[PDB]
Structure formats: C-alpha cells, structure tokens
Design a protein around this nucleic acid. Sequence first.
RNA 1: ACGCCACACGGGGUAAGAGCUGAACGCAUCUAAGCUCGAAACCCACUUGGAAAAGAGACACCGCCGAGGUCCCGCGUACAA
RNA 2: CCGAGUGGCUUGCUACCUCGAUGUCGGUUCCCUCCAUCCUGCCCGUGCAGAAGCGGGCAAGGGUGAGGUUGUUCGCCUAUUAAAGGAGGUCGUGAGCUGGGUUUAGACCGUCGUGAGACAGGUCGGCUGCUAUCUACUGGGUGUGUAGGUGUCUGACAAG
RNA 3: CUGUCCCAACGUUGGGCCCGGUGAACUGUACAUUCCAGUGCGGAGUCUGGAGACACCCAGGGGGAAGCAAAGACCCUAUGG
RNA 4: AAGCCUGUGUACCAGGAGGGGAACAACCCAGAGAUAGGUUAAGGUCCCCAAGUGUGGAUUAAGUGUAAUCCUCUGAAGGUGGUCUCGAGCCCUAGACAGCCGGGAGGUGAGCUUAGAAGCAGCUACCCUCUAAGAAAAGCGUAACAGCUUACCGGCCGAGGU
Lengths: 142, 160, 337, 172, 132
Amino acid sequence: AEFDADVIVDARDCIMGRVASQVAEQALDGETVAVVNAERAVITGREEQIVEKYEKRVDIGNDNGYFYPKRPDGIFKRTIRGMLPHKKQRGREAFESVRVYLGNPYDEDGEVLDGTSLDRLSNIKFVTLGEISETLGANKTW
Amino acid sequence: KPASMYRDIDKPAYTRREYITGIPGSKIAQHKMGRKQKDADDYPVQISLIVEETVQLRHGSLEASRLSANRHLIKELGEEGDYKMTLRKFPHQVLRENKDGMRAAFGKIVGTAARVQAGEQLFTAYCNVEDAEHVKEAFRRAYNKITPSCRIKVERGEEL
Amino acid sequence: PQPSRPRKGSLGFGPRKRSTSETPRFNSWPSDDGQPGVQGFAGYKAGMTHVVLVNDEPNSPREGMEETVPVTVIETPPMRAVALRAYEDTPYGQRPLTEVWTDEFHSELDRTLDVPEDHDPDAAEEQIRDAHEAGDLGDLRLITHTVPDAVPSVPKKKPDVMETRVGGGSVSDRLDHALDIVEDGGEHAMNDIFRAGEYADVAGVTKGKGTQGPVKRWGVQKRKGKHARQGWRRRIGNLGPWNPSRVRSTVPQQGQTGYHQRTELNKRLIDIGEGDEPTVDGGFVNYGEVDGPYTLVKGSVPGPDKRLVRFRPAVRPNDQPRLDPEVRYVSNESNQG
Amino acid sequence: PRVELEIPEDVDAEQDHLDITVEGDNGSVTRRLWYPDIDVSVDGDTVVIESDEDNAKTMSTIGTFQSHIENMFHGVTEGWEYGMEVFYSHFPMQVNVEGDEVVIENFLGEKAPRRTTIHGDTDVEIDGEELTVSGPDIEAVGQTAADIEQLTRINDKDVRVFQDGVYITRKP
Amino acid sequence: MEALGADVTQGLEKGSLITCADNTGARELKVISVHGYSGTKNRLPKAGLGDKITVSVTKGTPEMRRQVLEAVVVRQRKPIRRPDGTRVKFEDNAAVIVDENEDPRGTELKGPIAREVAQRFGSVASAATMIV
RNA sequence: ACGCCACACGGGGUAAGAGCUGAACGCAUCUAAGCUCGAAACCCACUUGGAAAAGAGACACCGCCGAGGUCCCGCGUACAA
RNA sequence: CCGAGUGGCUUGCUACCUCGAUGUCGGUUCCCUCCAUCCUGCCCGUGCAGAAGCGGGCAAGGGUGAGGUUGUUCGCCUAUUAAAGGAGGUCGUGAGCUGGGUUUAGACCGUCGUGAGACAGGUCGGCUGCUAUCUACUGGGUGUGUAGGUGUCUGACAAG
RNA sequence: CUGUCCCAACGUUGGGCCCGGUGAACUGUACAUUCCAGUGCGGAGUCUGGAGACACCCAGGGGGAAGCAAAGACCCUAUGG
RNA sequence: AAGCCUGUGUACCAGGAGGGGAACAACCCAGAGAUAGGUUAAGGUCCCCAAGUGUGGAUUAAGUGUAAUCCUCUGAAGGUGGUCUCGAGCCCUAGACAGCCGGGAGGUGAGCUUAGAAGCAGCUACCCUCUAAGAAAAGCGUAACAGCUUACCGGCCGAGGU
Ligand SMILES: CC[C@H]1OC(=O)[C@H](C)[C@@H](O[C@H]2C[C@@](C)(OC)[C@@H](O)[C@H](C)O2)[C@H](C)[C@@H](O[C@@H]2O[C@H](C)C[C@H](N(C)C)[C@H]2O)[C@](C)(O)C[C@@H](C)CN(C)[C@H](C)[C@@H](O)[C@]1(C)O
Ligand SMILES: [Cl-]
Ligand SMILES: [Cl-]
Ligand SMILES: [Cl-]
Ligand SMILES: [Cl-]
Ligand SMILES: [Cl-]
Ligand SMILES: [Cl-]
Ligand SMILES: [Cl-]
Ligand SMILES: [K+]
Ligand SMILES: [Mg+2]
Ligand SMILES: [Mg+2]
Ligand SMILES: [Mg+2]
Ligand SMILES: [Mg+2]
Ligand SMILES: [Mg+2]
Ligand SMILES: [Mg+2]
Ligand SMILES: [Mg+2]
Ligand SMILES: [Mg+2]
Ligand SMILES: [Mg+2]
Ligand SMILES: [Mg+2]
Ligand SMILES: [Mg+2]
Ligand SMILES: [Mg+2]
Ligand SMILES: [Mg+2]
Ligand SMILES: [Mg+2]
Ligand SMILES: [Mg+2]
Ligand SMILES: [Mg+2]
Ligand SMILES: [Mg+2]
Ligand SMILES: [Mg+2]
Ligand code: NA
Ligand code: NA
Ligand code: NA
Ligand code: NA
Ligand code: NA
Ligand code: NA
Ligand code: NA
Ligand code: NA
Ligand code: NA
Ligand code: NA
Ligand code: NA
Ligand code: NA
Ligand code: NA
Ligand code: NA
Ligand code: NA
Ligand code: NA
Ligand code: NA
Ligand code: NA
Ligand SMILES: [Sr+2]
Ligand SMILES: [Sr+2]
Ligand SMILES: [Sr+2]
Ligand SMILES: [Sr+2]
Ligand SMILES: [Sr+2]
Ligand SMILES: [Sr+2]
Ligand SMILES: [Sr+2]
Ligand SMILES: [Sr+2]
Ligand SMILES: [Sr+2]
Ligand SMILES: [Sr+2]
Ligand SMILES: [Sr+2]
Ligand SMILES: [Sr+2]
Ligand SMILES: [Sr+2]
Ligand SMILES: [Sr+2]
Ligand SMILES: [Sr+2]
Ligand SMILES: [Sr+2]
Ligand SMILES: [Sr+2]
Ligand SMILES: [Sr+2]
Ligand SMILES: [Sr+2]
Ligand SMILES: [Sr+2]
Ligand SMILES: [Sr+2]
Ligand SMILES: [Sr+2]
Ligand SMILES: [Sr+2]
Ligand SMILES: [Sr+2]
C-alpha cells in the first residue's frame, strides 16, 4: 500500500546477491528502496545444490524457531537483512525502508543496477527465485 | 597390525643385531626371480617400480607385493619365461610394539622393515620387448600392496 | 534393549488450546464440478439413536439384509444466505473485495450484527462483475446464519454466522446463482444441498473437559506396579534428556483438553426429513424434543448436545454414493434406562 | 566455430530467440536450442550455428544442434517412422489406439489394461501384429515407440522365459 | 482371513487356560500365541472367538499333554456383536485342536459353536453338533 | 472402553534404476546441452494453529452523543483464578 | 595375503576438567535424533523357469512386539511376526520411579595370614533429603502496540 | 485368589484452586527473554556467529542453572590422629 | 597415538597492553607515560564493516573454493575420454581415422587322427593360382556341415587422424 521509494530496482534477470549488496548500502545511506519483480531475480549455480541449501533452511528449526521464507518475496527480503545490522537502530531503520515486491506495483519501470544483470545467452546454470519458491512448496501467486 | 603403525620414518635407525635379540625371520622368500643364471644386460627392456614417498615397508608387505608380481610373470611367461626380476631392498630396520601402561614402555621386538626413500627403485625387472606389458601389469599389482604411490618407469627401452 | 513404541498422541491437532470460535470454520472446500450450489449447511446436535437399515453396499455378503446402525440426530432447520462476498486474487493470496446484501433480515439477526440500513447492492455487484472481466475474481462465498429460534431445544436466539463457499459451473453462472439466492431472502434448506446417502464432512468444537493430565489428554501410561505406590500415579517419567537442556513441546503435558475444532471426514447422511420420527421417548437427555427439519448422521459427531455443527460435501470420499438408504426402523426407545 | 546448414527446397525455417521452427509438407517442429554462447540463426536459405568459443563442451553442443536441425529437416519432409511387432506366447495380447494413447489388454493374462499416452502429433497405426509409429518430430516419435516397448516391461520374472511384449522392429 | 461377520472383543490372552471342546484326548489348553497377530509394547497378546491360536496341552492323556498344537477358538465368555446389534456370549472359553489344513484333529466336537466360526473353518463347523 | 464412528485417491518434482534424442569422437553412447519415466521417501492434496506477519492485514455494515461495551441479574454447550 | 581409510558403540592409553561432591549398574517411563536398513516402497544381478531364495542399489515415512532362566547389560531359549535392525542424546532420563547387583557398619563358607585381618571369591541382611528464585516448555489470563464498534475472512509462517 | 499386569475407568474422604485472618524458611557476586552451533581450563543464559524475542500475571509437571543441601566417607598425599 | 611422557636450544605466556585472527595465554603485527595531528604494520577493500563490485590475462562448474598456523582447517590408497595446456613418434589430398556399399575367389572338404572333423576337438605343416584383394583362418556359430563376421582389396566421403 504505497511506498515513497527514492529508488526502484528491477531484479529481473539480476543476480540476487549483488543486487542485495547494493540495496543494503543505499538503505544505510538513507535511501528508500523498492525491489521489483523479485520472482524473476536469479542466482547462479547448479539448481540441485541450490535447492538443497534452501530446503535445509526450511527444515531447520525448533521451539525457539527458525522462520525461513519460501516466497521469492521474503527470500530476497531475508537476503538483504543478512547484509544489514538489523538489530541496531540504524540497521533496523534502513531495513525497514526497503521493501520487495512480486512483479511491479508501480507505474515506473525499475532501473537495472550496474554489474547485477545476467546474460541468459551466456549462462545456463542458474535458477529463478520463483522456481525455488515453487520447489519449496510456495503457492505461485505471481 | 596396520601399517599406519610403522610406515613412517619417525624413529632412530634400529638395526644392530649385536644389541637386539629375538628378531622374527623375514617372510620374503626370494630377492632374485626369473632366470637368475642370466644377466640383466642380456635384455632390451628394463622396467623398475619407483616409490614416490619415503617410507618403511614391513617384510610382510614386500613378500605380498613381490609375490603378486612374480606370480603374474609366471602365469604370463611361464615358470621359466625369459625374464628376471629383482627386489633390491632388504628389511634391516627392526620394529617394536609396546604390548604396565606407559611405564617401562620400550617395546618388544615384533618385526622388520625396509626403509625406502622417495624416487628409489624397489623392484627392477628385465624382459624382452614382447613381455613389456606383462611386467607393467605385474608392477601395477605390486604397488597395490605397499603403502606409497609409485611410478612404473621404463629405463632401458624405447620401442614404443 | 528397550522395545520401540509409537509416541503418545498425535502432534497434528495442536496446539491443544481452547478454540477461538465455538462456530466451526472449514479450512477447505469441495472441487468445482456439477451445477453451482452452496457447499455447506449447519444444524444443532440433539443426540443419538439407532436405525435398522437394508445393507446398501453392493460388495457386501450381507447386501440386502437388516443391519443396525448408530445415528446422531441433528436438527437442521432452514438457514439464510444473507450476503454474497467476492474475493479477488492478489500477490498476497485472496482478499475480500466487496459484498452484496439484502433487505429481508430475520427479526433477531441484530443480536449479533449491526444490520445494514443503507447499502448499494448493484454498486457492489458492479464492482464484482468488473473484477470478473479483469480476471481477478477469486472464489465466491455466501455469508450465512442459522435460526436458533426455530429450534426450541436450544436456548439461544442469537444466530450463528458462517461463510460458505459457492462452487459450480462457470464463475459467471455460479455468480448469478449466488445473487439469486441472496436477493430472495437467502432462505435455503438441507435438501437444497444434500441428499440422503451422500458423504459429508462434519466440523464441530468438541466437548470441553477443562484441564486434564497427560494420561487422559495424551494417552500416556499410568505408573505401573510398585511405581504406582511411591507417590507418582499419573505423571510421566521425565520431561526430557539432560541435553537438550530444555523441555521440548513434544512431551505430553497437562493442559486444556476438549473444546477444540475438529473436522470429521466421510460421515454418511442416513436420512434428511422433518417431523418427530427420530425423537426418543422422555426426550433426548439434556436436550429436548425433536419435531422439525432434521438429519441423521451415521455414527458420532464432534461436540455436546446443542452445539452447532457444520456440514460440507465430503472433500475426500472413499466410497461411491448409494443414495436414499432404506430405513426399516428408527428407535424411539427412551435414552434413560 | 561456424556451421552452415542449407535448408531443403521443400522446407522453410523461421526462428525467433532461442526457438527454431521448421515447416514442411509433412508438418512442423519447433525446438529450443539454448546453450552458452552458441547463436543459431536463419540466414536466408541457410541455418547458421556459431560461437566464439571452441572448447570441447561447446563443440559438443554445436555438433548436437546440427543433428537436431537436420533431423527436423528430414522430419517435415520424409518424416520419421519406427516399426514394431507385438509378440506373445500363451496370452493373446490386444493392442489398440484409443484417443491419444495406445492401450494393451490381457498382457500375460493381466485383467488391468496397460497404457501410455502418445507424444505430440505422433501417429500410431496398427495392422495385425505390426505397429508403425510416425511423425515429423523424431523426439516425440522416438519416445512414443520406446514407451510402447517399455509398457510391457517385466522385472518380477525371468525375461528369457516370459518374452511377451511389443518390440521395436525397425529404426529410421 | 475371511471376515467373520461379527465384531469381537478378544476375551483371551497368551497364557489363558481354556477348554478343549473335542475328543482328541486333551482337556485343558493353554494359549501360547495368536496366528497373524502383532501387538504393541507391554500389551499381552490377545485372542478371541474365530482366531487360530497356537496352544500347549495342560490337561489330558499322557500322549497329548505337553504337546504344542494349533487350534481354533470356538466359544468365549466375553461378548461379541452381530450385524443386527445383538451381543452373543457363551458359558465358557473353548477351542478345537486343528492340523495344518485346519481339519479338526478329533472326531467329535463337544458343546455348541458360533456360526461365525463356521464361515472361516468349514470342516470344523461340519463337525459341530450345535451351531448358535 | 472392554463399546461405536471417521482417518484417500490423485497430482508435481526427484533418488536408485529403465529408456529417448544426441554430440564431443562421421560410428557407438541414457548425458556432456535437451527429454520421457520412476520410491512407503520430497512438495501439493487433507487436518490443526495462526493479525504482534512492526509491510502489525482485508471486507461489509453500525456509530462518533452515542454504535457498542462493562457492572448487575437467571444460568451453562464453558470453567482451578 | 597385503595395502588405504571412516567412525567414536567396546577396550586400552593419557591425566586436560571437577575431590569447600556434576548421585552407581541394570531396569523403567517420556521425548528427539543417526544410518552402517531388520521389515515395508522402488530398483539391479543371479549358479533368475515358477515358487521360495541369495547378493547388491536408492531410501530413515512408519514399524521392529509378547514371554522362560539370570540383578544383569550381553546372551541362551519358546511361540508368535511383514520384521520382531543397530546406535547417539552426561554409557539421555534418581530436584521421575525402582533398589535386584557393585561398594559401609552385622554374619557365614572357602583360600591366605602367627595375628589383627585380607580377597578384582561366594553368600543372608542392610536408608533414597529439598515448599522452584531464574530459565524451558504445556495450557490459562491482563495490558500495551497496530489506531470508535460489530460480524465475517485472509494466510506470512507453524505442527502432523 | 486377585487391578501386580493386559489397560485403564468411575466414585469416596482430606488437600490442591478462589476468598478473610495469621504468617515463616531454604537461597541470593553481578547481570539475566532465550535457542542452535562454535569457542574456551577439554561439560557456556553472559565469549563469537547466527536464529528467535512486545511487557506483566495464573496453574502445572520438574528439562537446564554440571539446581539447593554437607570444606568427598572413595583414591592418593602429610616425616597427621 | 595423544590437548602423552621425558630431554635440549630459542623466543614467547606466566608477569605483556594495543592492532589482526569470528570468539581464543603463548599464531601474525607490535613491546606501552599523557594529549594531539599524521603515515604505516599485520591484515583487509561486494554488504554486514573503514577501503575496489580495481586492471591485464588464464583456469575451475564442483558452491570445488571463499579455511596461513591449529586438539580446532581432514581427506587416503586406488581410479577418472570432466576439462585446459605443452612435448615426442607415426599415418595422411598418390585420400588418412571412422562409418556405409561392394568383394571377400580357386587347387582343397589341406595331411594326419577319426565312423566324421570340411579355418575354428587335437597333432604337424602353414604351401600356389587368379588378382585390385582374400589366412593351410583372428572371433562367434554347428552333431559335423551351414551360417555370421576379423583380417585383407575396391568405392563412396573429404581433413585431419592415431
Ligand atoms: C531423610 C532425611 C535426611 O536425608 C538423607 O538421608 C538423604 C536421602 C541423603 O542421601 C542418603 C542416601 C543415599 C542413597 O543418597 C541418596 C546415599 O548415597 C547418601 C550417602 O545418603 C542426602 C541426599 C545426602 O547427600 C548425598 O551425600 C553423598 C555422600 C553424596 C551425594 N551427591 C553429592 C553425589 C549427596 O547428594 C546427605 C549427605 O545426607 C546430605 C547432607 C547435606 C545433609 N544430611 C546430613 C542431612 C542432615 C540428611 O541426613 C537428611 C536431610 O536429614
Ligand atoms: Cl522452526
Ligand atoms: Cl545487528
Ligand atoms: Cl552456464
Ligand atoms: Cl511406571
Ligand atoms: Cl505371542
Ligand atoms: Cl619491553
Ligand atoms: Cl551455496
Ligand atoms: K571429585
Ligand atoms: Mg441411557
Ligand atoms: Mg436398555
Ligand atoms: Mg523369483
Ligand atoms: Mg515391558
Ligand atoms: Mg545434578
Ligand atoms: Mg545408505
Ligand atoms: Mg524419522
Ligand atoms: Mg546414563
Ligand atoms: Mg534428573
Ligand atoms: Mg534422588
Ligand atoms: Mg523433590
Ligand atoms: Mg540379593
Ligand atoms: Mg545383597
Ligand atoms: Mg575436602
Ligand atoms: Mg578409606
Ligand atoms: Mg604466575
Ligand atoms: Mg564501506
Ligand atoms: Mg566446501
Ligand atoms: Na550463487
Ligand atoms: Na525453517
Ligand atoms: Na607395574
Ligand atoms: Na513420595
Ligand atoms: Na541426571
Ligand atoms: Na510422484
Ligand atoms: Na579413525
Ligand atoms: Na539406569
Ligand atoms: Na525408515
Ligand atoms: Na530374557
Ligand atoms: Na552424568
Ligand atoms: Na537409576
Ligand atoms: Na532416589
Ligand atoms: Na484399584
Ligand atoms: Na527443572
Ligand atoms: Na615477556
Ligand atoms: Na581479536
Ligand atoms: Na560451499
Ligand atoms: Sr559499497
Ligand atoms: Sr618418534
Ligand atoms: Sr599404494
Ligand atoms: Sr468458517
Ligand atoms: Sr487454514
Ligand atoms: Sr519410595
Ligand atoms: Sr546444556
Ligand atoms: Sr537417471
Ligand atoms: Sr493487528
Ligand atoms: Sr545415506
Ligand atoms: Sr525390502
Ligand atoms: Sr553398560
Ligand atoms: Sr552371559
Ligand atoms: Sr536409552
Ligand atoms: Sr541392594
Ligand atoms: Sr557376582
Ligand atoms: Sr564379597
Ligand atoms: Sr513502543
Ligand atoms: Sr509444583
Ligand atoms: Sr571486481
Ligand atoms: Sr580477471
Ligand atoms: Sr576442542
Ligand atoms: Sr591441515
Ligand atoms: Sr587419490
């Protein structure tokens, strides 16, 4: 429900980790960031080992709890949180001025951050956040 | 007993039989095989098995490897084939075992081993160009019974 | 060597706490197949009796023979679908879009709701159809309520309100089907949805037992033999190993037992009638006399007499339906004796 | 490297992105040829498979794409056909095509019918104890044939004695 | 096994002493095991009307005593339910010795038998004098 | 409870494995790209909890001088307070 | 045969930790886990006709029970069973139980000792404390936050 | 012969729970909402990395604080008794 | 064998801060009065986190790896047409390597052994015609034949092959 984002990033075909790294840096510098088309963000590697890692994170836990997201929505949000001192005042403020979206709820098209784009014509070993979420059991709402 | 117990050279040389008694006999049956009445120079091909790491090889291993190697040469060239093989090392190093805990631990005598430095020839066979691939096969079986990785090297021989 | 043994009780019905709504809330609905139709109904539990039936099952050696069967009698008077709520598909699941209400309200629906005085049915309806054109319309459901007043044995007059999904042919057709029902007055009956012989899933909030110990609540053993005289009779051995140094939520412990929601699957509807054929002499104990629209459910139903129970077409039936079973006898013998 | 495939006069091949479509009198076939740094394009009267890299892994796929395309050429003109023979010993096997799947009844006396769905626009024709699988897409046809033979697979008993089943008789 | 056509509350356990309702020479039988049965921790294995059980002979002729044989439970004191709802119970617990093929080892059966047992073991039933 | 009722099937993706098309290596090849299948196991299905999910939610109506709620009273389908 | 390893269940070694005290063995009860899989599912080979097997692969979802001797763990034995697998959690579990064994004070026997008395021999008898501060969890409330009320829902996650 | 057991149920009396009155003790370096791993004198609520965590209160059975209680009664040592 | 025992030389901890190493007596930098400015050391420069999403070039597809030292970071003997790079020998447009088509012929089914053995049970020998080739037969197959192919020669193809 409306988010005055100073910056709108398009994650489509972009390496999740590299985008996250830059989005963290900016939020800490006072920027309100909105990541768009999360379901289409991507992560390099052999799909089978990638999925195993995220599946293990879902299985992990106990009474204290280890709530790990399954939707591309939260996967990306959590990825960003891991690059912020979210338990400190300054850190929580930055993280909270960053939101991720499935698709693009804005009118503007997001911008592509430098060095984050992936060339499908040069890469075959990579996966889509959306593909991971479906594998994880998420309900494809996108 | 595992070789892990004696394969390394982590003890002084212990070979003086004038100060050591009750040393077990060697299990190595022969050091000169094939046609020992002939010379090594009477052959065109000479292949040696070279040890790649410095180690100690218990007489039990020498015999097992020497056996599995010469035993193959016999099966492929006959009990009198035209070849000759040599195990040049002898197990001089006496081995102990402490079989009272660590009190008066000096071990009792339990065996013998040969110290081989990396790059040395453990075995050296001499054959004819025909039986060159057979000696290479005997060695492959031999190095599967001694601690270190080895190289099968062709010294005198270029018919390739 | 310590024999194996399944744990005590299931870990799938927790946490075992007091239910939030005494009115059951289905968390799943039947699939869309036949013509459009309301996918549920409700009534009030009255009690039990038995009926003699003619073996229906075509694969039974007893097919065609007399067979005694336990039956729970549920009073199922007509209900009232008072509104049509529409859901829209969004990236965050389904969300209510709008609702279409009516004018005809039961004289006492205002005991639970703030009945509408000013509403625009067409404005809402329009928003729904525009949504359907856009292709963002999620399933369609009806706000429904009971008429306790029609059931003398139940003290309450305050109606119980639940939402029931409408499934059917095309969305356009079931949408229209819904609007029709509502507009009228919403009045519908068990007949309109179920037919004797079909399988229904019954939901309800079980009988309450307050706080109970591990033995009753989880089915753990009582202390045995000599152990039962030392000071411990109904207490488990330990709360866990040395490590982990915490008590896991999986160990059977004391607490609230009963008054939980339960959804009992594949309950066969033996008969849907009206009158007093099923009432027992002297009256159902702690309930009263049945003389009106009723339903006979094969076997047991969760909840105490007088509690609201909800019906739903079986979502996972095992057997094919054998409609209108022949009832040769319904016991009216007193339940006191 | 670069390889040029001259498309037959009978055929016309169009292509957008990583997808190539081949149409002929015998039908059409569309495929995805996606591999790092290999560009597949339709240059007028020829299909071009090229890449700036020449490592073993790249050469492997290039040679693979070629055959896939040549097979498509052959598929839309001459077509692809596999022949099969239904052999049985004691129990008369009933093989029929029903809808978009080939059904086999009474296999080894089984009461339950074994079946498999047909892939793509593949056509299965039965004439007595002879079956013929055909179509423009060698992928779909080849699988349908195989699936039929697999359909009578038996692991429980000695296959040397229980040899009933449908087998591939002719490969194109 | 074939359905009994009646619900049974096993009234016997491993170790129970019951009557041998035949003329084999065995008077008292001790239940040792229940064919096809698998219990659960601490549960004493149970047997009831209709079950085939392994047994040892506690009382009877010298030749029969101490022998480990198979048998079929024909009567039990604990009630059983029939399709029409009615419960049926007997005056005692009894079993009939049987061989590999389930044929009664003896020539005659003593006392009444339950009709449900007939369904399962025909040759046993076709030796019954009374079937209730 | 010793009594009675109810507790799937089916989809999706895989392992081992069976194969298809297929090159590196003109052949061959279940694999290197691609694909068809395939476990009581994985995901969905089903049951239970769940607006404190800090992005702290949605809908409808009622109401802001009055909607609604508490206390009070008679009681339990509830309950150690 | 010889050679290379993995585990940390046995045993041995060491003497790092605790002697102003971290309660023993076995059992029991209750919870979680590991896979080197006993059964069950899906497979491969066969000295695979079939049936019944033998061997191997994936696989830890579920199951792996009742009894006779013995304090026993272990193990032996019986009848059942699809099978009646093994192991970790302070050799899980005494602010939970038991107290049969080990290992106090009484006594006997054998062996040893001049003797007191001893035994890594046997045997009969021989005690089980505490009102929970914190934390943990099972269930139940009161408040604050979200920011007037009633009713109906959504589903991030969570459990089977 | 029997609830010792299969396998537990219901009931009775006194407590327990709520209210009036009376009113201790054990224990207390400090801090303290923890959990999973790691590290560390090799057995951590406090160190490190993550995870989780709105506060307060009631009842409970005792997993942890190598829980509380007693300068170990085993073992060794003392130019001890 | 040990985070074992017992020597020796040395530096360190003990009794040594501060910087780095996630934490961490003795590993790295470093030996330190107070205060202040500056420049470096070890170590580090995608984020958490000060400084590069630095440059030229190559390799790796396993998340190998992102782990100086170590009780602490394992990974072995054995194996690998996974892939990259370098060397040597030989064959090749007088057409190589492979594949496909064609030919694979006669004396004679060699002699011997044998009831029989005719490439192919065993023993010995292993010769010459036609020719562009074709064994007294390399591997299956048959009771023995038959039959199916290897060698060998020719064609098709066309570039490296081994
Ligand atoms: C019945 C009441 C009595 O309570 C007992 O008898 C207990 C069951 C007793 O226990 C009895 C019985 C038994 C079987 O232990 C449960 C036995 O082994 C010990 C010696 O004595 C305790 C557990 C003993 O304390 C234990 O002393 C052992 C030597 C070490 C052990 N721990 C540290 C490993 C420790 O808990 C102790 C030595 O008695 C504790 C000491 C502080 C105080 N006692 C002297 C008091 C006055 C007690 O007499 C008592 C309260 O009046
Ligand atoms: Cl969790
Ligand atoms: Cl932080
Ligand atoms: Cl790639
Ligand atoms: Cl107990
Ligand atoms: Cl048994
Ligand atoms: Cl100094
Ligand atoms: Cl990873
Ligand atoms: K101590
Ligand atoms: Mg009654
Ligand atoms: Mg009666
Ligand atoms: Mg078989
Ligand atoms: Mg027991
Ligand atoms: Mg303690
Ligand atoms: Mg395994
Ligand atoms: Mg499990
Ligand atoms: Mg223990
Ligand atoms: Mg304890
Ligand atoms: Mg105690
Ligand atoms: Mg206590
Ligand atoms: Mg005793
Ligand atoms: Mg005693
Ligand atoms: Mg002391
Ligand atoms: Mg003493
Ligand atoms: Mg000091
Ligand atoms: Mg920075
Ligand atoms: Mg790694
Ligand atoms: Na990655
Ligand atoms: Na998780
Ligand atoms: Na000694
Ligand atoms: Na007590
Ligand atoms: Na303990
Ligand atoms: Na599946
Ligand atoms: Na080891
Ligand atoms: Na114990
Ligand atoms: Na399992
Ligand atoms: Na025993
Ligand atoms: Na302990
Ligand atoms: Na104990
Ligand atoms: Na005790
Ligand atoms: Na009792
Ligand atoms: Na505790
Ligand atoms: Na110093
Ligand atoms: Na540091
Ligand atoms: Na990794
Ligand atoms: Sr940055
Ligand atoms: Sr040494
Ligand atoms: Sr070796
Ligand atoms: Sr509901
Ligand atoms: Sr739900
Ligand atoms: Sr006691
Ligand atoms: Sr702990
Ligand atoms: Sr496969
Ligand atoms: Sr809220
Ligand atoms: Sr495994
Ligand atoms: Sr199996
Ligand atoms: Sr033990
Ligand atoms: Sr024993
Ligand atoms: Sr245990
Ligand atoms: Sr005792
Ligand atoms: Sr003893
Ligand atoms: Sr003694
Ligand atoms: Sr606040
Ligand atoms: Sr208490
Ligand atoms: Sr860079
Ligand atoms: Sr570079
Ligand atoms: Sr350590
Ligand atoms: Sr190392
Ligand atoms: Sr290696």
